[PDB]
């Protein structure tokens, strides 16, 4: 019977971790400077190679 | 023809003499000084009125008088 509880524990922690990912996604979206610096970085990369 | 069915008898409507608060008993000598100070900031005195409610504590030189027994017996005799 102990093995049965093992599966339940994995599901319980899995749901808790899922909610944590949503909070971090908000920050990314809400962040302006992060996106701005990231955007710029990419552009220069291709120009140097071309 | 839609009035109340029961008469109005609530305490709020009709003020009465009572104490809506509980507190531990206090020594007679301790509370006597406090009451005197309030009276200085200007029928039976307030000290005697509060004693009937059993507010003070039974100290060494102050004990609650016993109830009237010798002046409260009223019996009737009849055959059986």
């Amino acid at each position: 019977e102990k093995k049965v509880t093992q599966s339940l524990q994995t599901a319980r922690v899995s749901r808790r971790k899922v909610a944590h990912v949503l909070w971090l996604k908000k920050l990314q979206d809400s962040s302006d400077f992060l996106q701005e610096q990231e955007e710029a970085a990419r552009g220069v990369a291709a120009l140097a190679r071309a | 023809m839609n009035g109340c069915s029961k008469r109005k008898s609530h305490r709020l409507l009709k003020p009465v003499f009572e104490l809506q608060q509980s507190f531990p008993k206090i020594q007679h000598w301790q509370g006597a000084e406090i009451l005197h100070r309030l009276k200085q900031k200007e029928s039976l005195e307030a000290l005697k009125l509060l004693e009937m409610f059993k507010v003070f504590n039974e100290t060494a030189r102050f004990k609650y008088p016993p109830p009237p027994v010798h002046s409260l017996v009223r019996g009737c005799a009849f055959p059986f």
């Binding site: - | 023809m1 839609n2 109340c4 029961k6 008469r7 109005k8 008898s9 609530h10 305490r11 409507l13």
Partner: protein
């Protein structure tokens, strides 16, 4: 006296939920002694909870008792209280002897029975929420002044 025992009062916790969903129970029987809201056996709040505990003794669960109690008391309002009120109100309309046309020496000339049909004169309705009665008295006053 050895058989005496102390039991837990279950009404303290059960009554909290009843008032939360239906907080319009304190208005009834407010001016009577014994009732506090800062309750008597006759109070609606005590009556409703009494049935809930009695039903649970048979085997019903705590949540199931609420549904059964709500329906049991609902019928009394619509089958007895509503019927009684409506029956009595009907008789008022019949009292049209004051009109001159009621007896000849025809189209009625006075609107006395018409007003009583909508429940405005000596025939008042019975609501459940306390807000309805608060606004009802307002209407009365409004119409009273205009008459003058």
């Amino acid at each position: 006296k050895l058989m005496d025992r102390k039991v837990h009062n279950k009404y303290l916790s059960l009554t909290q939920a009843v008032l939360k969903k239906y907080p319009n129970m304190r208005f009834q029987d407010c001016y009577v002694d014994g009732n506090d809201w800062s309750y008597r056996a006759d109070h609606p709040v005590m009556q409703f909870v009494a049935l809930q505990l009695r039903l649970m003794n048979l085997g019903l669960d705590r949540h199931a008792a609420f549904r059964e109690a709500e329906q049991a008391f609902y019928a009394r309002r619509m089958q007895l209280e509503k019927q009684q009120k409506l029956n009595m109100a009907a008789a008022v309309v019949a009292a049209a002897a004051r009109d001159p046309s009621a007896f000849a020496r025809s189209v009625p000339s006075s609107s006395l029975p018409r007003l009583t049909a909508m429940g405005l004169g000596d025939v008042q309705p019975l609501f459940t929420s306390g807000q309805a009665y608060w606004q009802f008295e307002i209407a009365k006053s409004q119409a009273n002044h205009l008459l003058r």
